[PDB]
């Protein structure tokens with residue numbers, strides 16, 4: 026397309042746009058829980074309510090989401106750093122390292138580390154380089170009070186002010 | 189609707205940085221808007237996305253010229269965020285800005301970083317368009333990011 030910025034320049038830029046932190050979960054086609062830490066969550070539209078997440082091609086989580094067409098977005102509170110670490114690290118059995126429950130849909134809900142969970146139906150996808158944007162039409166939301174966890178400038182932080 | 193309100197309440201609790209996304213329209217006029225939907229998409233090549241309302245002046249400009257700038261606001265930039273989200277006309281007369289060599293508007297006083305992007309694709313979703321921006325050039329300085337979350341502005345705390 027033309028000149029591209031060096032990957033380190035891009036990483037430095039995007040490190041300076043802080044975000045909340047989710048764990049995006051699903052079941053694979055055999056019913057096994059899958060999930061990953063995800064900071065690339067944003068709102069797409071209100072009609073109907075649709076968010077998006079951007080997941081690596083070949084990841085276990087995207088494989089499950091693509092096959093089953095459902096996923097949950099678990100928004101982490103300020104007590105959820107360890108869950109974010111578990112779900113981005115090398116442990117082979119991540120759901121043994123967090124407290125979690127299964128909703129009627131089967132989707133994993135990190136009910137001790139997340140202050141909100143949105144259950145979503147996949148309504149579309151768009152491949153982009155090594156990743157895929159997944160559009161999720163929100164079907165159900167459970168939300169409680171909590172201070173959001175943040176990630177920015179290569180560090181965890183908490184949203185700094187009370188509700 | 190009630191479903192829409194529940195969704196707004198959810199997404200309000202996902203805080204973010206704040207950008208002003210700028211472009212030139214097909215007639216050369218600067219356009220832009222406040223944007224919190226900046227999202228990293230991939231590194232091959234480095235590509236971010238934004239979600240812009242269909243029919244917005246900024247989306248029309250981005251679509252016409254196939255380029256845009258993402259100006260990341262520092263914690264002194266609330267006023268620019270308000271100008272670029274509010275109803276009052278003549279936004280560019282209400283901020284100090286300069287033109288990059290490419291022509292794209294750079295909010296030099298309110299932003300700590302500016303990324304110049306080429307539009308590599310667009311996908312409509314409901315009444316919005318997801319715009320994929322392949323990043324071509326970045327100017328970045330130290331700065332403390334402005335944040336927006338829980339229906340308020342704040343500053344990155346570290």
Ligand SMILES: Cc1cc2nc3c(=O)[nH]c(=O)nc-3n(C[C@H](O)[C@H](O)[C@H](O)COP(=O)(O)OP(=O)(O)OC[C@H]3O[C@@H](n4cnc5c(N)ncnc54)[C@H](O)[C@@H]3O)c2cc1C
Nearest residue numbers: 061062063064065079080081084085086113114115116117
């Ligand atoms: C703050 C933050 C934000 C992130 N945001 C995103 C995002 O938006 N999108 C995205 O795609 N990624 C993101 N990641 C990276 C993502 O969390 C990890 O790549 C995660 O490992 C993907 O898990 P998976 O099970 O889907 O994938 P896989 O890579 O398929 O991992 C399969 C399983 O292998 C194990 N495993 C994982 N990594 C290793 C390893 N290095 N060595 C050995 N075993 C391993 C785990 O049990 C994992 O469940 C983020 C990470 C962080 C820290």
Ligand SMILES: Cc1cc2nc3c(=O)[nH]c(=O)nc-3n(C[C@H](O)[C@H](O)[C@H](O)COP(=O)(O)OP(=O)(O)OC[C@H]3O[C@@H](n4cnc5c(N)ncnc54)[C@H](O)[C@@H]3O)c2cc1C
Nearest residue numbers: 035036037039040064065079081178179180228229230231
């Ligand atoms: C959208 C996304 C995709 C990811 N894909 C992978 C992956 O394929 N394999 C893997 O092992 N880990 C992946 N990760 C995890 C990533 O490599 C970092 O470990 C994590 O983002 C935390 O990085 P850091 O901010 O502390 O610093 P850095 O690694 O310097 O990253 C700075 C910022 O750059 C962006 N970024 C970094 N890596 C990627 C990437 N691969 N794609 C898109 N944006 C990126 C993020 O916004 C991140 O916060 C991904 C993260 C994100 C947000």
Ligand SMILES: Cc1cc2nc3c(=O)[nH]c(=O)nc-3n(C[C@H](O)[C@H](O)[C@H](O)COP(=O)(O)OP(=O)(O)OC[C@H]3O[C@@H](n4cnc5c(N)ncnc54)[C@H](O)[C@@H]3O)c2cc1C
Nearest residue numbers: 221222223224225239240241244245246273275276277278
């Ligand atoms: C924190 C935050 C984040 C946001 N994030 C996003 C995002 O990611 N995506 C998105 O699409 N929107 C977002 N918005 C909303 C967006 O900034 C505004 O809708 C903005 O007005 C769009 O500008 P435009 O010039 O492209 O639109 P237009 O509606 O085409 O407005 C044209 C011009 O008319 C004036 N004007 C604007 N609104 C009105 C009005 N209601 N009545 C009369 N004149 C008006 C302004 O001068 C504007 O430049 C966000 C707002 C906030 C506060």
Ligand SMILES: Cc1cc2nc3c(=O)[nH]c(=O)nc-3n(C[C@H](O)[C@H](O)[C@H](O)COP(=O)(O)OP(=O)(O)OC[C@H]3O[C@@H](n4cnc5c(N)ncnc54)[C@H](O)[C@@H]3O)c2cc1C
Nearest residue numbers: 068069070071195196197199200224225239241338339340
């Ligand atoms: C991606 C995005 C798109 C937007 N599109 C428009 C638009 O088309 N017209 C307009 O006048 N203003 C739009 N806005 C501005 C928006 O309506 C709010 O005025 C602004 O986000 C500040 O709201 P708030 O967070 O304080 O509270 P709320 O209005 O409660 O919004 C909470 C969150 O809900 C989501 N959201 C709100 N409105 C929209 C929307 N219309 N489309 C998608 N997600 C939304 C965002 O994630 C926002 O942060 C948009 C904002 C964003 C982030």
